[PDB]
Design a protein around this ligand. Structure first.
Ligand SMILES: N[C@@H](CNC1CCCCC1)P(=O)(O)O
Ligand SMILES: [Zn+2]
Length: 867
């Protein structure tokens, strides 16, 4: 055997450039014929022309004559090519209705869509399908007019016409050179929603959102979010849109959230459709973030793109950071920052600790689809955010300006972005490069002592080995710090000649001591404020120290982290008692802290809600060996039961408070959303302590179902209830919203995520629900994905959870390797499990491995876990 592993160190500029890409699509039933004409520019004369492609090849020509070529695997090779400019004409045939991978050209809802990133364009035609090859596209499309009245592609519509036989055609010209992965085509019967935005230079931009006729009324918020994003990028980053047309297309079958194709973005329906009746406040915020994200890609991704796919975080890390700053500037910056940190530590940290751990800029990959990960995206954003921390907003923008000045119209690397940041500010960032090349979560060990009038903060750093790399050198780690006295008041100190109440301590060595001089009283340190670096901080805090930080600190994260720590320690105490077979702990100081949080009316409602959130099981067994997931589940559940029952009267009271302040404002707004978020936390505790309350809710369900946030909130709260009423409410829910695909996703999520004893069989029934389709990524993730993360059921001792998921990985991989490769990572905890479960997981992975024709996607992941 010899698998194909791609290595960053092997990168070489392409032997050929493509200057012009003329495409012609003849759409018929069932087949679509693609005819191309490529203007090829030799870079290394004499080398064979190598084109990537997997579509059915009908013909290929060089300068109009039948070319001498060989087709081997997914590569087309022409040995004898001219020494000077020449043309290549490829004719391929596609059957989009048979394409269930949702990559390349495929069918959905009777319409045609494309998804090309990273390497889907080669599934359409034979091309030099790599992002450092940039060409100017002109796309002609021909199709039956009544079946396909809407024909879209990148850029400006410059021509079109009618044929006597009912067909019609259009011609699209994208004047901006782009890599193949940004190509897009849409053909079908879609309703259009029109609007516009006027740029700073006074140019109107026509906005067009395309959806089904039925979904059109739900696209309003996405349009407004787009216009906000366009304005924000102008005011915050000085970036202006470069076309007089911007199109967004919703598609129900889509592997991810959205795609930033130049002037023709394609969105998963869940990140563009919403109304208060069918979408939660979180869905709205999701639309705002992703719509912004895809537009922000127009500069950070499109105008400046990636030299190679190892540089993916260059556009994704940066663009995520941008949509985060966009959402933060819109509303609730502090609360939304916590949400992002929580997401990172709950999903990215486990990845950096697991068998699939990789650097933000990987050094190798087998299948690039597997590296659109939490690391590349979210940790990538944290890396970008550290530029902002080190340089400040103005300095950051200087780097942005120089970044675009240097590389507009180019395909560059993470190094180039770092260099632009360094050169624009006249600062050295050589060591910062390690954030891109070194995987793993850094661990900080901090010690504090006040002697004389100096608070000596000693901080050590180490980064654990990862499967890709053992050697990990000291990294540039900014640690924002503060000090609180016995009364929790801000204490001033002198750091390198400056008496401020806050400072960024720059840790660059294995061990450093920071001297906070001029401290005239006892202090408790506030560390890693705002999560100034993506790291694990260990400091010897007493319980009382955490109570002080939670009660009086000025930074949102450190307050929240203090609460998180108390919860974490409480679960640790539960584990001990449950293991020793004795009564549960008292958690006296925890309960005292929570009581203070609940009764504090000066706390922001959304921030209060976060303070009342308990860390996930994954957070709780972080850095543990021989894990029994059910024991951690038991300990966490026991804590939630204690909090639920102990404060039950006050959960009602707080619920009442939030209902009054909501003030019947059921439409989405950051203000009203805050109260509902808090309200739903209360509902979760109330129905945990008093399950019978479900019957009171059911009695006045209609009165209470004033929007989807409320319906979801209550169905979530009762989803674990063993009452028959739980099942009935879910059934009524499905009946009520049977016609709304996105709401049915919620239904299947509730079925798959239930703590109830009979979840496995309810899930297997859901597989045959008429509104369920395994071939639809949203549905698959909703039902199967949720189950795979259902701790008590996925990690069932009898192994039923493992066998079920393994079957579905095998089943899904037959048509959609990407969904399957994501699903199979539910087994990532394999080697850290206790012997019995680890054995069963290994059997499942071996069974997946034994499958003939198993995708490279899943195969790569399975290898990381087993080998
Ligand atoms: N680049 C976009 C995701 N593209 C996926 C879509 C489906 C196939 C793999 C690439 P995003 O990060 O802006 O959301
Ligand atoms: Zn993106």
């Amino acid at each position: 055997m010899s698998k194909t592993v791609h290595y960053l160190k092997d990168y070489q500029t392409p032997a050929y450039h493509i200057l012009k890409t003329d495409l012609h699509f003849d759409i018929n039933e069932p087949q679509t014929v693609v005819k191309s004409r490529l203007t090829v520019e030799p870079q290394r004369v004499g080398e064979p022309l190598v084109l990537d492609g997997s579509a059915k090849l009908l013909s290929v020509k060089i300068n109009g004559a039948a070319a001498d070529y060989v087709l081997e695997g997914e590569t087309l090779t022409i040995a004898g090519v001219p020494s000077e400019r020449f043309t290549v004409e490829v004719e391929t045939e596609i059957l989009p209705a048979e394409n269930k991978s949702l990559m390349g050209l495929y069918a959905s809802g009777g319409n045609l869509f494309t998804q090309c990133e990273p390497e889907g364009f080669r599934k359409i035609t034979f091309y030099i399908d790599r992002p450092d090859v940039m060409s100017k596209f002109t796309t002609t499309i021909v199709a039956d007019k009544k079946r396909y009245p809407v024909l879209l592609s990148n850029g400006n519509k410059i021509d079109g016409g009618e044929f006597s036989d009912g067909r019609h055609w259009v011609k699209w010209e994208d004047p901006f050179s782009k890599p193949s992965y940004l190509f897009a085509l849409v053909a079908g019967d879609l309703a259009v929603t029109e609007d516009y935005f006027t740029t700073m230079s006074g140019r109107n931009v026509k906005i067009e959102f395309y959806t089904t006729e039925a979904d059109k009324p739900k696209v309003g918020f996405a349009v407004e979010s787009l216009k906000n994003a366009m304005k924000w990028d102008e005011t915050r980053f000085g970036l202006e849109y470069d076309l007089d047309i911007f199109m967004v297309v919703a598609v129900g079958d889509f592997n991810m959230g959205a795609m930033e194709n130049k002037g023709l973005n394609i969105f998963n329906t869940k990140f563009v459709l919403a109304d208060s009746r069918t979408a939660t406040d979180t869905d709205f915020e999701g639309i705002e973030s992703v719509v912004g994200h895809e537009y922000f890609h127009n500069w950070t991704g499109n105008r400046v793109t990636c030299r190679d796919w190892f540089q993916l975080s260059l556009k994704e890390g940066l663009t995520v950071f941008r949509d985060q700053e966009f959402s933060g500037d819109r509303a609730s910056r502090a609360v939304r920052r916590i949400e992002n940190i929580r997401l990172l530590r709950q999903h990215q940290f486990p990845e950096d600790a697991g068998p699939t751990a990789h650097p933000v800029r990987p050094a190798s990959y087998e299948e690039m689809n597997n590296f659109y990960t939490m690391t590349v995206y979210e940790k990538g954003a944290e890396v970008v955010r550290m530029y902002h921390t080190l340089l400040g907003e103005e300095g950051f923008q200087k780097g942005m300006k120089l970044y675009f000045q240097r590389h507009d119209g180019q395909a560059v690397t993470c190094d180039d972005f770092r260099a632009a940041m360094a050169d624009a500010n006249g600062i050295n960032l050589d060591q910062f490069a390690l954030w891109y090349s070194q995987a793993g979560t850094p661990v900080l060990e901090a010690e504090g002592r006040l002697k004389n009038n100096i608070f000596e903060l000693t901080v050590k750093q180490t980064v654990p080995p990862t499967p890709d790399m053992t050697d990990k050198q000291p990294m540039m780690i900014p640690v924002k710090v503060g000090l609180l006295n016995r009364n929790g008041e801000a204490v001033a100190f002198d750091y390198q000649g400056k008496r401020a109440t806050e400072a960024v301590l720059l840790l660059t060595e294995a061990e450093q001591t920071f001297l906070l001089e001029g401290v005239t009283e006892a202090v408790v340190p506030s560390l890693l404020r705002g999560f100034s670096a993506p790291v694990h901080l260990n400091y010897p805090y007493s319980d009382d120290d955490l109570l002080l930080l939670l009660a009086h600190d000025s930074d949102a994260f450190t307050r929240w982290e203090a609460a998180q720590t108390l919860y974490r320690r409480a679960v640790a105490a539960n584990l001990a008692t449950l293991s020793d077979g004795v009564e549960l702990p008292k958690h006296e100081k925890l309960l005292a802290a929570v009581e203070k949080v609940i009764s504090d009316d000066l706390l922001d409602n959304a921030f209060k809600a976060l303070l009342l959130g308990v860390p996930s099981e994954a957070e709780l067994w972080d850095g543990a060996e021989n894990i029994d997931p059910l024991r951690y589940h038991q300990a966490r559940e026991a804590l939630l039961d204690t909090l639920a029952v102990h404060f039950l009267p006050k959960w009602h009271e707080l619920n009442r408070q939030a209902a009054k302040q909501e003030n019947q404002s059921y439409e989405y707004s950051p203000e009203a959303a805050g109260w509902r978020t808090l309200r739903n936390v209360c509902r979760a505790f109330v129905l945990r302590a008093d399950p019978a309350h479900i019957e009171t809710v059911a009695e006045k369900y209609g009165e209470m179902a004033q929007n989807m946030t409320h319906e979801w909130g209550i169905l979530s709260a009762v989803n674990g209830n063993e009452s028959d009423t739980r099942n009935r409410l879910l059934a009524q829910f499905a009946d009520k919203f049977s016609d709304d695909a996105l709401v049915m996703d919620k239904y299947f999520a509730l079925v798959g995520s239930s703590r109830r004893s009979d979840t496995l069989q309810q899930v297997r029934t859901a597989l045959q629900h008429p509104k369920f389709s395994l071939e639809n990524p949203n549905k698959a993730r909703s039902l199967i994905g949720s189950f795979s993360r259902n701790v008590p059921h996925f990690h069932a001792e009898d192994g039923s959870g493992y066998r079920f998921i393994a079957d579905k990985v095998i089943e899904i991989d037959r048509f959609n390797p990407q969904v399957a490769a994501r699903l199979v990572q539910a087994f990532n905890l394999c080697n850290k499990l206790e012997p019995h479960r680890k054995n069963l997981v290994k059997q499942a992975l071996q069974r997946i491995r034994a499958q003939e024709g198993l995708s490279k996607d899943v195969g790569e992941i399975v290898g990381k876990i087993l080998d």
